[PDB]
Design a protein around this ligand. Structure first.
Ligand SMILES: CCc1cncnc1N1CCN(Cc2nc3cc(C(F)(F)F)ccc3[nH]2)CC1
Ligand SMILES: [Zn+2]
Length: 291
């Protein structure tokens, strides 16, 4: 019988229109002393909106059935009259965004590591019928060792929203596929575009299609006129060209091979997928050692 009173609030990890994420300590039971992350959703707001309700149930179901080392673990879920609670593993490594902002640009073997781990998470979600959509660096966390964790499966985390039918334009749209922005229907190919955009950001310091305003940023994304940096290896350039294509069906990973098709690319040739999945490959950055 898990109740709100079983946890002590330590601090706020995030705050949005739909609720808050806390670092908490369990103070009862066999996990006494153990640290978790706790998402607390405001029920009253969600219940009114039918698609907000659906999407909230969806996140629960998703994390309940997913189990993979590169995806965040859900431990408990419970409810009161006013609140919905998700108890997830606490990830002390911070957002991948922080590493990139620290470093400016990643070396290629640094990028390769993260992108490889992410590709295995995506392959797992794709086998389960799940589409991540947005691989902006703030949507990816690191655990205590420095390994990747995908975390963004729930409601829009933003404090103000764009429109009142979708939550597509509320955050940055710089890592999203053209077909998502056009709302013309899409599938898992959307994730491989986004991996390409993340990769481009890692290796050049900014996402591939940016404008001074949103309307121009959107136009740039739909146009999809890619600028490949000359200083990147031929392997990195070949992979970026195959991910960032306007024709979704023709992206690497779009076909039946999915992740295995991307994982076979020469850019990832030094990866042992057995060791990586087992988390035996040393990460490029150790959050524990970070001053
Ligand atoms: C929950 C997994 C996690 C594990 N360990 C440490 N940090 C974590 N999170 C990862 C997610 N992150 C971004 C974030 N998501 C949010 C969702 C909401 C919502 F309530 F949905 F409105 C509000 C603020 C939010 N901020 C905060 C820290
Ligand atoms: Zn929103």
């Amino acid at each position: 019988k898990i109740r709100p009173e079983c946890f002590e609030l330590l601090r706020v990890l995030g705050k949005g229109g739909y609720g808050k994420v806390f670092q908490v300590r369990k103070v009862t039971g066999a996990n006494t002393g153990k640290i978790f992350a706790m998402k607390v959703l405001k029920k009253a707001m969600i219940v009114r909106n039918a698609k907000d309700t659906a999407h909230t149930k969806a996140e629960r179901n998703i994390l309940e059935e997913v189990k993979h080392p590169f995806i965040v673990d859900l431990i408990y879920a419970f409810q009161t009259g006013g609140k919905l609670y998700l108890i997830l593993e606490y990830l002390s490594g911070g957002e991948l965004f922080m590493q990139l902002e620290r470093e400016g640009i990643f070396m290629e073997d640094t990028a390769c590591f993260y992108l490889a781990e992410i590709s295995m998470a995506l392959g797992h979600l794709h086998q389960k019928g799940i589409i991540y959509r947005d691989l902006k660096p703030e949507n990816i966390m690191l655990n205590h060792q420095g390994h990747v964790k995908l975390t963004d499966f729930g409601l829009c985390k933003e404090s103000i929203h764009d429109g009142t039918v979708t939550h597509t334009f509320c955050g940055t749209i710089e890592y999203m596929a053209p077909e998502i922005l056009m709302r013309s229907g899409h599938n898992r190919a959307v994730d491989w575009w986004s991996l390409g955009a993340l990769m481009y950001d890692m290796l050049t310091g900014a996402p591939p299609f940016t404008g001074e305003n949103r309307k121009k940023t959107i136009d740039k994304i739909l146009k999809c006129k890619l600028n490949l940096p000359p200083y990147l290896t031929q392997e990195a350039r070949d992979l970026l060209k195959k991910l960032l294509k306007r024709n979704a069906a023709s992206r690497l990973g779009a076909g039946p091979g999915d992740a295995g098709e991307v994982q076979a690319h020469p850019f990832f040739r030094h990866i042992n997928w057995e060791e990586l999945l087992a988390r035996k490959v040393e990460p490029p950055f150790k959050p524990l050692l970070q001053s």
